[PDB]
Enzyme design. Structure first.
Site, PDB file in Angstrom:
ATOM      1  N   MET A 192      -6.534  -3.718   0.865  1.00 29.91           N
ATOM      2  CA  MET A 192      -5.143  -3.413   0.513  1.00 29.91           C
ATOM      3  C   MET A 192      -4.667  -4.127  -0.743  1.00 29.91           C
ATOM      4  SD  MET A 192      -3.150  -2.909   4.052  1.00 29.91           S
ATOM      5  CE  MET A 192      -3.061  -4.666   4.401  1.00 29.91           C
ATOM      6  N   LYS A 246       0.738   3.513   7.376  1.00 33.34           N
ATOM      7  CA  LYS A 246      -0.310   2.856   6.631  1.00 33.34           C
ATOM      8  C   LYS A 246      -1.232   2.243   7.682  1.00 33.34           C
ATOM      9  CE  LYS A 246      -0.773  -0.402   2.756  1.00 33.34           C
ATOM     10  NZ  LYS A 246       0.024  -1.280   1.856  1.00 33.34           N
ATOM     11  N   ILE A 253       3.212  -5.993  -1.648  1.00 28.14           N
ATOM     12  CA  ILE A 253       3.181  -7.377  -2.137  1.00 28.14           C
ATOM     13  C   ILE A 253       3.138  -7.439  -3.678  1.00 28.14           C
ATOM     14  CG2 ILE A 253       0.755  -8.098  -2.386  1.00 28.14           C
ATOM     15  CD1 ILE A 253       1.338 -10.501  -0.582  1.00 28.14           C
ATOM     16  N   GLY A 254       2.747  -6.339  -4.317  1.00 27.08           N
ATOM     17  CA  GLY A 254       2.732  -6.272  -5.768  1.00 27.08           C
ATOM     18  C   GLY A 254       3.108  -4.896  -6.291  1.00 27.08           C
ATOM     19  N   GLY A 255       3.601  -4.039  -5.405  1.00 24.58           N
ATOM     20  CA  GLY A 255       3.955  -2.686  -5.791  1.00 24.58           C
ATOM     21  C   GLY A 255       3.418  -1.615  -4.866  1.00 24.58           C
ATOM     22  N   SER A 256       2.749  -2.032  -3.793  1.00 22.08           N
ATOM     23  CA  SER A 256       1.996  -1.096  -2.957  1.00 22.08           C
ATOM     24  C   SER A 256       2.799  -0.005  -2.226  1.00 22.08           C
ATOM     25  CB  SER A 256       1.142  -1.864  -1.957  1.00 22.08           C
ATOM     26  OG  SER A 256       0.010  -2.398  -2.608  1.00 22.08           O
ATOM     27  N   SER A 293      -1.274   0.090  -2.481  1.00 20.93           N
ATOM     28  CA  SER A 293      -2.253   0.332  -1.432  1.00 20.93           C
ATOM     29  C   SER A 293      -1.797   1.350  -0.395  1.00 20.93           C
ATOM     30  CB  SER A 293      -2.654  -0.981  -0.750  1.00 20.93           C
ATOM     31  OG  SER A 293      -1.523  -1.662  -0.241  1.00 20.93           O
ATOM     32  N   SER A 294      -0.509   1.695  -0.387  1.00 15.73           N
ATOM     33  CA  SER A 294      -0.033   2.728   0.528  1.00 15.73           C
ATOM     34  C   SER A 294      -0.360   4.131  -0.013  1.00 15.73           C
ATOM     35  CB  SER A 294       1.480   2.599   0.759  1.00 15.73           C
ATOM     36  OG  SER A 294       1.849   1.268   1.062  1.00 15.73           O
TER      37      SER A 294
END
Ligand SMILES: *[C@](O)(CCCCCCc1ccccc1)c1nnc(-c2ccccn2)o1
Ligand SMILES: *[C@](O)(CCCCCCc1ccccc1)c1nnc(-c2ccccn2)o1
Ligand SMILES: [Cl-]
Lengths: 548, 545
Positions: free
Chosen positions: A161, A112, A208-211, A187-188
């Site tokens: 991100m 990433k 941090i939230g599902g990335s 974001s990944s």
């Protein structure tokens, strides 16, 4: 702050650097293929990582063959996905110095864009980070190299991100490898699209939230988000610093569960623990991962927050049934107070300062369309967020809750919020123990949303962000694909709230026939191995072909 | 409007008194039935040998328990360290798991360790008459290991102090000299263990609260990395403050006891009962290692002038380590003033003390807290103004004051990031010298009663390692001589502010009192820290092993 001249110049420079990177890759690949016309590239590219590693270790496959064949594949799949932002220049000489006894010797790895790599920008799609090359590799990149891996590309992320789509004004839009009208998640996302199309056997992302979990599920690959401080974050490029209520976590993405386990085993070594003494030195516990004992599996088919799609629900239910037939004990379980954990604890923890620090990254920059209205909303005066919150509350309580909890507050109120997070974590741990669970099976958002909609369906992060809030390890495994029967039932989808988030999600998940759908596996803090043991079980039962 | 708080003090004192009478009645019954037991010999056995005799059946848990109970009761008469007798411990005594690593070992607990049915007052009226619903996790683990927690020991009010007095149970005294503080906030533990009334205790530490009492009372203590042991169920006064983490750890008469305690605590029971603790078992081979060490050291932190005794303790220890084959390397963590004044203070008081102050509404403020409450109560603009006025002549005072102001979540994030980068800085500094461990002075000898609260600067030697979150422990290595004491007359702080002036007088009249050094390792390196403490102990007081 209306002038865009600086942002335009940054995009111009970044686009040229990407363009030249791709050309460089293309030339190396062509030069290699000329010298090796008889190499069976397909056989090599379809080898599961464990077998690839084994052939690299024995000398059956040379690191050069593996590298350039994967490079070629990455270059080609990038044509339809735009997932690669930069070719890691010096990696051709890293290749010839890879420690021969490394657990990842000769393995091409994709990073990433936020993983600092010496001599490259980590822009995060932000003009203010362009032209500022990292001056050293980050810790996990150093550890990857000491284990003989060869990081070879930086992959695209949505701007900042903070998004589960994947576009930015510098490198543009990454597309789902399965359907070019779909988001690859984020974001990944660049990682998801590159790995999901076969262009890399292993990647690192952050979450941090599902990335890590969105792109894995949207692109149909495996991903694990460990406990936040299981791996070193030293040297990672970020957009916000010192926010610790909801910790960032970094972790592997790959085509199978064994690959994530191999990666964690290589990372959780003395090199890492010495380079970053702040990481508790917990070696990877292979025997927990390899265990074949029956599990007590808590499960739910919905979190009563985001209505699952018919595909998600079928995926969860079929997995539950296979697990029961395999001798596991399935037990209904729902973490308590999910709306509170999402609206108050998670949102509050992520935006304790009203978004001010986060907004600093955007001054003078373009705001990518994939971020929806987030930047506009964060920019609203605190008093006005509050007033709007009180107005929307009778109509759209979910929208009002988020708005209210994105307001700036004092250190005193943040301490209070941090204590509540600590107490919430203990409350779910107590539920878990009272039910004597080993692991927890949950739906995972899918199928892939249409491009540019994730930023307008914030509610749908409910399945993943709960476990960032709780800081439990959580991974996703692909278990099925959307059938026409599933897709047609989307027309009956209403959502629990019927607000704009539900309306957007309904439309965004349509036209998804053929797309992969995952489930999520969760274990207690520091139980990455048990979480992987469960993921391995799910993969074996739903997709037996992914294991020998 | 403190009438309610007077009622709280009345009730607390009655409970303490009833607890003590209950102890005495049980001790007297036991003695009558066991007139031939050699109590002296039992009491002086080092913990390791005591444990072995309980395990082998040579000593009965009842004999050990009632002998220590009688000793605790007796020493309490001169120190006032015991606040509560843990009601049901006698029945725990009879159900104590035979296989436990701590089978039949009486353990004292700092008052903040929640015990079912008991108040954890923290010396605060608002916590009186609020019995705990259950034992905290470490208490549960102690009992699962066959230990018998038997008393709650005294703390200064709110625990944010390195003295030991509160309005409920009164003032705890140093067992060596009744005019001296036992240190704090684990002061009751220090007094009890240091006078032989308990072989093992648990304390907590956010700015030196395990290490002060240990040094002042002449015992050993270890402050582990913050999250090495579970804080679940601990009674606190401020909640959600995560910039400077509280740490909990053992205190005892020797190093081996500390290692035994950590070993018993770091087990599956703990890791299962509190999954948020990284499940890192105690690493015996690191503790037992005999390899030569690269030992960083300083004689002074250039912040708190060491007493002649502290300096002599540090230097003699350094020389003994050099003679024993270890390499001594001058090393001082960079920017200590910053770490103390900006990071630590700012971390502890990010909200200007408002959450802390809440505990004191309607309550007395113990004299041992000095002016802390009064100062915290000042408006931010006034702390700022007063800070600017003090700065020219008293920069240390100005810096603390300015950093005790309230701030936004945004600035707290910035502060947290700076703490994180400072930790990385010292770690890199440490690695550039290839250190294994760090040897430092430890504040001593014990200060006169009611002076710690007026010598805040003196927390410099200990609080640095809460800021950095490094395991740190203290070991007694010498006692104050007539010469050390006489040389206090020449003592001058580096600042000449009121903290230096108070400290100078506070450390006088200390002939015969114990003095320690501090041992430090990197995060998560408790075993290496103990290995090093064991070495110091062996070299400076050979009879402990
Ligand atoms: C990803 O985990 C982000 C996934 C999308 C999260 C959306 C969260 C949300 C909540 C409430 C309102 C709006 C949006 C990810 N990956 N990296 C990062 C990240 C975040 C901050 C700093 C550094 N990295 O997030
Ligand atoms: C002890 O470590 C406290 C020792 C004294 C620290 C004084 C620090 C200071 C800094 C700046 C200005 C004034 C004073 C200890 N033990 N427990 C606790 C504690 C603290 C808060 C909550 C719970 N426990 O502190
Ligand atoms: Cl941790």
């Amino acid at each position: 702050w209306t002038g865009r001249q600086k942002a335009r110049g940054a995009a111009t420079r970044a686009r040229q650097k990407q363009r030249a990177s791709l050309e460089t890759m293309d030339k190396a690949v062509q030069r290699f293929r000329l010298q090796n016309p008889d190499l069976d590239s397909e056989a090599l590219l379809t080898l599961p990582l464990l077998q690839l590693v084994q052939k690299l270790q024995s000398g059956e496959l040379s690191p050069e063959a593996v590298f350039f064949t994967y490079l070629g594949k990455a270059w080609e799949v990038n044509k339809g996905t735009n997932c690669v932002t930069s070719y890691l220049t010096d990696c051709e000489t890293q290749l010839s110095q890879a420690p021969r006894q490394g657990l990842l010797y000769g393995v091409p790895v994709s990073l990433k864009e936020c993983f600092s790599y010496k001599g490259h920008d980590s822009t995060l799609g932000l003009s203010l980070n362009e032209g500022m090359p990292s001056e050293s590799d980050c810790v996990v990149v150093q550890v990857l190299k000491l284990q003989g891996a060869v990081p070879f590309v930086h992959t695209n992320v949505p701007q900042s991100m903070f998004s589960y789509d994947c576009s930015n004004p510098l490198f543009g839009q990454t597309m789902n490898p399965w359907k070019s009208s779909k988001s690859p998640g984020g974001s990944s996302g660049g990682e998801g699209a590159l790995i999901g199309s076969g262009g890399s056997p292993l990647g690192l992302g952050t979450d941090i939230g599902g990335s890590i979990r969105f792109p894995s599920a949207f692109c149909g690959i495996c991903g694990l988000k460990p406990t936040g401080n299981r791996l070193s974050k030293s040297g990672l490029k970020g957009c916000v610093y010192g926010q610790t209520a909801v910790q960032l976590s970094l972790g592997p993405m790959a085509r199978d569960v064994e690959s994530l386990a191999l990666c964690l085993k290589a990372l959780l070594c003395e090199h890492l623990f010495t380079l970053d003494p702040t990481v508790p030195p917990l070696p990877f516990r292979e025997e927990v991962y390899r265990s074949s004992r029956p599990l007590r599996v808590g499960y739910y088919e919905t979190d009563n927050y985001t209505m699952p799609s018919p595909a998600m629900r079928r995926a969860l239910i079929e997995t539950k049934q296979r697990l029961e037939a395999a001798g596991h004990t399935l037990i209904p379980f729902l973490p308590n107070n999910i709306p509170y954990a999402l609206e108050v604890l998670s949102t509050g923890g992520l935006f304790s300062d009203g978004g001010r620090s986060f907004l600093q990254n955007f001054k003078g920059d373009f705001v990518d369309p994939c971020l929806g209205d987030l930047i506009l909303i964060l920019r609203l005066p605190s008093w006005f967020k509050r007033l709007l919150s009180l107005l929307l509350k009778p109509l759209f309580p979910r929208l009002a809750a988020f708005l209210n909890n994105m307001r700036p507050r004092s250190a005193e109120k943040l301490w209070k919020l941090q204590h509540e997070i600590e107490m919430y974590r203990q409350s779910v741990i107590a539920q878990w123990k009272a039910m004597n669970l080993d692991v927890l099976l949950t739906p995972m958002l899918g199928p892939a949303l249409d491009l540019n909609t994730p930023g307008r369906a914030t509610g749908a992060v409910s399945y993943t962000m709960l476990y960032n809030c709780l800081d439990f390890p959580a991974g996703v495994v692909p278990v099925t694909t959307v059938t026409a029967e599933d897709d047609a039932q989307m027309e009956l989808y209403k959502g629990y709230f019927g607000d704009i988030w539900d309306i957007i999600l309904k439309k965004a998940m349509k036209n998804s026939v053929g797309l992969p759908v995952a489930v999520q596996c969760v274990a207690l803090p520091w139980q990455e191995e048990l979480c992987l043991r469960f993921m391995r079980e799910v993969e074996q039962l739903m997709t037996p072909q992914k294991q020998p």
